[PDB]
């Protein structure tokens, strides 16, 4: 009935099914939602993270071809607050399983599933695998 | 004004931002549209084309996350015929730049271009030139 606010951050580098998959649980998780994406810079990737194969503006470009995506932010704090919460009135944060449990305690978490075995690193795997080892 | 179907096919492997640019570009070609999509199977694709990494579920199944697409024929006939236009009430095929003579004489023919760099083997590349030659 009323449109809940939903808010999934992530790197999402490399888009595959398993962001997708992710991203549409997010955006169905009432029946009227409005699904914000928030895109990690690059900079903070690298320090907190990890390396990091695209630039934001190619992160956040892909993420707009996103069907269930209809706002992002980017790029977004690295760490979620109260006061980011209210600055977009989000609902809810969805994200998957602590720096979650005062999302917990206010009622404002929902999870969502990491499916595996689809990774874009996966399906280089699988091209590699076409020359035996001998 | 009134609906147009339009229809882009092709074998969509390793879904990137190359080929959700050209969906967008079918998609926008009139105000009202809609976007059929064509996956081409796993055999004529390894017959007449080259290597596929990921199989028709997979191509399809990425492909039914992104915006622009409406409706998805999969798998799809290896070759556009004047029958199978009418079978969908087709009135526009989007493709690029002859196999579409007979679509271009026709007036059914809408060209959409190809954006280089962004491939997913092009992002390979990049992690790769992480490591110097010595």
Chains 1, 2 share one sequence.
Request: aromatic share 10%; hydrophobic share 35%; net charge negative.
């Amino acid at each position: 009935s009323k449109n809940v606010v939903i808010y999934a951050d992530g790197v999402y580098d490399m888009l595959h099914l398993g962001h997708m998959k992710q991203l549409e649980q997010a955006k169905k998780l009432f029946e009227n939602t409005t699904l914000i994406v928030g895109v990690t810079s690059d900079n903070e990737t690298k320090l907190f993270k990890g390396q990091v194969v695209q630039t934001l503006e190619e992160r956040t470009e892909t993420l707009k071809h996103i069907r269930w995506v209809d706002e992002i932010i980017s790029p977004c704090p690295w760490v979620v607050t109260p006061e980011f919460l209210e600055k977009y009135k989000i609902d809810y944060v969805a994200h998957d399983d602590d720096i979650y449990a005062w999302l917990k305690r206010a009622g404002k978490f929902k999870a969502t599933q990491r499916t595996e075995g689809v990774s874009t690193t996966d399906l280089i795997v699988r091209i590699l695998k076409n020359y035996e080892d001998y």
